[PDB]
Amino acid sequence: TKPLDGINVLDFTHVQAGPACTQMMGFLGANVIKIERRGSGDMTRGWLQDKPNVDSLYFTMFNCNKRSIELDMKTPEGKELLEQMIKKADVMVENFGPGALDRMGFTWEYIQELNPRVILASVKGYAEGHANEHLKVYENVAQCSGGAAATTGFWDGPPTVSGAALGESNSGMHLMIGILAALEIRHKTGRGQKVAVAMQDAVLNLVRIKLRDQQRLERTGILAEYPQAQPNFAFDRDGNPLSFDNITSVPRGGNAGGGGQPGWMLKCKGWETDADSYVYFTIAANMWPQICDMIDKPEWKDDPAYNTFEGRVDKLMDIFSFIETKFADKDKFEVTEWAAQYGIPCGPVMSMKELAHDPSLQKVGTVVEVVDEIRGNHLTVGAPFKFSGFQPEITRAPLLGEHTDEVLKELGLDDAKIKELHAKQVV
Amino acid sequence: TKPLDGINVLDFTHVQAGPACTQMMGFLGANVIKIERRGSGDMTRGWLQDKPNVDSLYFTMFNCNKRSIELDMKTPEGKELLEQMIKKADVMVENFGPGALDRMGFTWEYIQELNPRVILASVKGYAEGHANEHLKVYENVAQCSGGAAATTGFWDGPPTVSGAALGESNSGMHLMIGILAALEIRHKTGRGQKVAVAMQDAVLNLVRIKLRDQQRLERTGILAEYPQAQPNFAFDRDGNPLSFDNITSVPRGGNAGGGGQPGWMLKCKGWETDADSYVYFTIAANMWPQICDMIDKPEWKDDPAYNTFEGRVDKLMDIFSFIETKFADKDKFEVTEWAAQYGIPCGPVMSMKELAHDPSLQKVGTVVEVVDEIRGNHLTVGAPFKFSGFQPEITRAPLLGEHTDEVLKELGLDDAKIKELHAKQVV
Numbered sequence: 001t002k003p004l005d006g007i008n009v010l011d012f013t014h015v016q017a018g019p020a021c022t023q024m025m026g027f028l029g030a031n032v033i034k035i036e037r038r039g040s041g042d043m044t045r046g047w048l049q050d051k052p053n054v055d056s057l058y059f060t061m062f063n064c065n066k067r068s069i070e071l072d073m074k075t076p077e078g079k080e081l082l083e084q085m086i087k088k089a090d091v092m093v094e095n096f097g098p099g100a101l102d103r104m105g106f107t108w109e110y111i112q113e114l115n116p117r118v119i120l121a122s123v124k125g126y127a128e129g130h131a132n133e134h135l136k137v138y139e140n141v142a143q144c145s146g147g148a149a150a151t152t153g154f155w156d157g158p159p160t161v162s163g164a165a166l167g168e169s170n171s172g173m174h175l176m177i178g179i180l181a182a183l184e185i186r187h188k189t190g191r192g193q194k195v196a197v198a199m200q201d202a203v204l205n206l207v208r209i210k211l212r213d214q215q216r217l218e219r220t221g222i223l224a225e226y227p228q229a230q231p232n233f234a235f236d237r238d239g240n241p242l243s244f245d246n247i248t249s250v251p252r253g254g255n256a257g258g259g260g261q262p263g264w265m266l267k268c269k270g271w272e273t274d275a276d277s278y279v280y281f282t283i284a285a286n287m288w289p290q291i292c293d294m295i296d297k298p299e300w301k302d303d304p305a306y307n308t309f310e311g312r313v314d315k316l317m318d319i320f321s322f323i324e325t326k327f328a329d330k331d332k333f334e335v336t337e338w339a340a341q342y343g344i345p346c347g348p349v350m351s352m353k354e355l356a357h358d359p360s361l362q363k364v365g366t367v368v369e370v371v372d373e374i375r376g377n378h379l380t381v382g383a384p385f386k387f388s389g390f391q392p393e394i395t396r397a398p399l400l401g402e403h404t405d406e407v408l409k410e411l412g413l414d415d416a417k418i419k420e421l422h423a424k425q426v427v
Numbered sequence: 428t429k430p431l432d433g434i435n436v437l438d439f440t441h442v443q444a445g446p447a448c449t450q451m452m453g454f455l456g457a458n459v460i461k462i463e464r465r466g467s468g469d470m471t472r473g474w475l476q477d478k479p480n481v482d483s484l485y486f487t488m489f490n491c492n493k494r495s496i497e498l499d500m501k502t503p504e505g506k507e508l509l510e511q512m513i514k515k516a517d518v519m520v521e522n523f524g525p526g527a528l529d530r531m532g533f534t535w536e537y538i539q540e541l542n543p544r545v546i547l548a549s550v551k552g553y554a555e556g557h558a559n560e561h562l563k564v565y566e567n568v569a570q571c572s573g574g575a576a577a578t579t580g581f582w583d584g585p586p587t588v589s590g591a592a593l594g595e596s597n598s599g600m601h602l603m604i605g606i607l608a609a610l611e612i613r614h615k616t617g618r619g620q621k622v623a624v625a626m627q628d629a630v631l632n633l634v635r636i637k638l639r640d641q642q643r644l645e646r647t648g649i650l651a652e653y654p655q656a657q658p659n660f661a662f663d664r665d666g667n668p669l670s671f672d673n674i675t676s677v678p679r680g681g682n683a684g685g686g687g688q689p690g691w692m693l694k695c696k697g698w699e700t701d702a703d704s705y706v707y708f709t710i711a712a713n714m715w716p717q718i719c720d721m722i723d724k725p726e727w728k729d730d731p732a733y734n735t736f737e738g739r740v741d742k743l744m745d746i747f748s749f750i751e752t753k754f755a756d757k758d759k760f761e762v763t764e765w766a767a768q769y770g771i772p773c774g775p776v777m778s779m780k781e782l783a784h785d786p787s788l789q790k791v792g793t794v795v796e797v798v799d800e801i802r803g804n805h806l807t808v809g810a811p812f813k814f815s816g817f818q819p820e821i822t823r824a825p826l827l828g829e830h831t832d833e834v835l836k837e838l839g840l841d842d843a844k845i846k847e848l849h850a851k852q853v854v
């Protein structure tokens with residue numbers, strides 16, 4: 001049974017945040033109708049195409065399980081069609097610029113009038129009421145606005161963006177929670193709501209641990225687990241010691257633990273020609289005895305200045321450079337095995353080539369081969385939530401306006417009226 | 428009113444992913460009962476305490492809108508209590524080791540007998556059926572497993588962890604989608620399901636954009652939007668040149684645009700001294716004339732070496748370098764306002780200090796002061812989704828076992844039976 005079987009989604013989205021949300025609703029069984037610009041459609045179609053005149057992978061990987069209709073909404077008749085579509089919809093999703101949908105006349109107040117059951121769901125860069133409410137935002141702008149960039153990277157480098165789509169897809173996933181929450185509200189009230197997710201807010205929610213850190217820092221002057229609190233280890237630009245003397249905002253800690261336990265990122269065989277031949281190594285509180293076995297160093301058991309958290313930070317990074325020579329003659333996976341006999345959260349850095357073709361991930365339906373007979377098959381990420389009673393069936397992305405007529409006929413429009421809308425350049 | 432009003436959650440979780448998920452359900456009105464170990468409780472209580480004897484900000488910021496019972500599940504009397512609680516619950520959420528709830532005599536199969544309505548939701552490190560199914564994993568190991576570390580950072584540095592909790596909180600937010608999807612299945616079938624989110628999978632979902640890049644790289648040999656595509660721009664740590672001639676796995680791209688339009692992290696006034704004195708500036712394809720106006724390069728408007736994306740591939744990092752030059756005497760807010768005039772996607776790197784005291788974020792309920800009379804007030808991140816007909820009411824995290832007797836009394840137990848359980852050391 002598919003969770004969102006029977007849910008009609010009127011999908012006005014483009015780029016990533018919005019499309020990611022409705023695609024995933026589609027994977028869970030929603031009937032998604034993507035509305036697009038005439039001629040060029042969603043800007044992802046033409047964005048970094050790998051073949052001329054063929055929809056890009058940006059588009060196909062975010063628009064499976066959708067049908068497409070073209071529509072000029074800057075048109076009297078196009079507005080009319082939208083009203084009809086809103087009357088059949090359970091949820092309408094949009095991620096156009098601030099005020100864009102309002103300017104077309106589709107304010108929340110008006111949408112409620114058209115259909116008291118419909119949920120409007122929107123992604124914006126900043127929350128409504130925010131000073132930067134009206135700004136247009138892509139991915140890394142939101143990473144910066146939400147605290148992630150400031151706390152990511154090294155103490156002697158710039159704010160650093162995550163390769164993960166903290167701004168875009170992460171927002172779409174948060175919107176999905178909001179929409180689903182709203183559907184649960186509606187079971188109770190019989191009424192739709194507006195839900196919105198700001199990209200800044202979705203990023204900040206993942207950066208909660210760093211707001212923890214900010215308060216700890218404000219209250220105590222120190223973050224004891226951060227590299228900067230370890231004696232003459234971190235150094236700034238000029239050959240100087242760093243410390244928390246003179247740091248009042250959570251700093252970048254390179255490859256330290258974050259919201260997990262303390263660890264570091266360690267080189268393995270072939271690192272010079274293989275950018276991803278590394279493991280990460282968590283040295284936690286719960287499992288310190290089990291860690292001292294692979295290092296063939298039992299001297300750290302009796303020592304009070306090694307086996308406690310507070311009696312360990314003073315030389316936290318000395319322990320890490322130790323092992324990096326001990327991993328020097330072993331690949332990622334062999335280093336991982338060599339230690340994993342002990343129940344240590346220790347893992348390889350997986351490369352995109354390894355993940356894309358990993359048999360495990362394809363077996364569990366997390367990386368999925370989409371059968372696309374028009375364009376040729378491509379991989380995608382499937383549903384990251386696995387259910388005992390249901391499996392997603394992922395189905396190729398629509399050609400531009402491929403379902404236009406089929407959608408217009410479902411609305412009750414006759415064959416002659418369909419030709420008029422075509423010739424008036426509305427569809 | 429509230430989305431999850433009337434939903435009872437049996438919350439066995441600890442640390443981050445699981446507690447983030449049940450806290451957010453709590454913020455949306457769920458009745459959340461956190462089951463904790465006698466004596467110690469959730470390990471976050473004692474981790475990174477800012478005052479000793481007082482529950483850490485790690486715990487309070489992940490455990491608002493919850494009640495706490497102490498319960499030794501290993502005793503037989505604690506198992507019969509669990510059976511009564513399961514029969515009243517709509518959802519059970521656990522992390523623990525990959526097969527820990529099963530060991531305790533509460534397998535999915537048994538749970539269904541007790542309550543055919545209940546949803547069992549789990550966070551694990553890797554998906555069931557994966558080779559690494561059995562592994563314990565923390566934040567940074569999960570980032571490594573899901574492709575984020577490989578594609579985050581710079582081409583001349585190591586895989587870099589993201590400060591955002593891609594593995595932990597991100598997994599809990601994905602599980603919440605999962606739980607809410609399962610609650611919608613249940614409206615249709617009257618039956619609960621098992622839902623599970625592997626941390627690797629939640630990470631990979633956000634790294635979907637990089638699986639797009641991996642395929643583009645395999646198909647075409649080049650990622651034209653990456654710095655490495657500029658001839659003679661990028662070099663490894665030993666000074667060897669880095670081009671796409673030799674790259675077979677999606678590389679680290681520094682502060683390139685991701686799923687956004689091309690951009691970079693540019694220095695503003697004070698950057699040598701202020702770690703966060705930067706903006707993200709986007710060079711979108713539709714905005715070249717405007718950029719040329721902003722930086723006074725009218726000669727670049729009609730020049731094909733500059734006026735398309737394709738023409739900029741060989742020189743984009745040089746254009747960013749020159750743009751940056753215009754910001755040397757302006758702070759990040761002045762640069763943002765200046766770029767806003769032109770409609771350019773551009774914002775500041777907000778520091779955690781700035782975010783913690785930002786008036787906009789408090790006004791919209793995204794940074795919230797929690798009233799906590801026991802520990803003193805603290806900030807937290809509130810609900811990142813804003814609704815037209817409901818507001819969260821965030822209440823302080825429970826003291827260990829604060830609500831044990833209150834909870835045993837809602838089950839129906841009388842004063843004498845609760846007296847005996849305290850004596851037996853079950854609760």
Ligand SMILES: CC(C)(COP(=O)(O)OP(=O)(O)OC[C@H]1O[C@@H](n2cnc3c(N)ncnc32)[C@H](O)[C@@H]1OP(=O)(O)O)[C@@H](O)C(=O)NCCC(=O)NCCS
Nearest residue numbers: 015016017036037072073074095096097100103125136137
């Ligand atoms: C991504 C973003 C920056 C791109 O902005 P953009 O390319 O300038 O396009 P916009 O969304 O602002 O749309 C431009 C106009 O086209 C209009 N439009 C969109 N589809 C149309 C169609 N089918 N027919 C007629 N007009 C249409 C919009 O209503 C808007 O009108 P306006 O001039 O009244 O504002 C912007 O859409 C945005 O800030 N989105 C919100 C946050 C977000 O999701 N961004 C990350 C990308 S997923």
Ligand SMILES: CC(C)(COP(=O)(O)OP(=O)(O)OC[C@H]1O[C@@H](n2cnc3c(N)ncnc32)[C@H](O)[C@@H]1OP(=O)(O)O)[C@@H](O)C(=O)NCCC(=O)NCCS
Nearest residue numbers: 286442443444463464499500522523524527550551563564
């Ligand atoms: C985070 C993690 C690595 C911590 O692991 P840990 O420190 O080794 O603790 P565990 O979860 O393995 O629990 C240890 C044992 O205590 C038991 N236990 C937990 N609560 C108990 C209680 N209240 N009373 C009695 N026993 C209890 C567990 O059942 C487990 O039993 P086991 O030895 O048979 O496996 C692990 O819980 C995990 O990988 N979680 C799943 C995914 C996840 O959320 N991880 C990221 C952390 S948020």
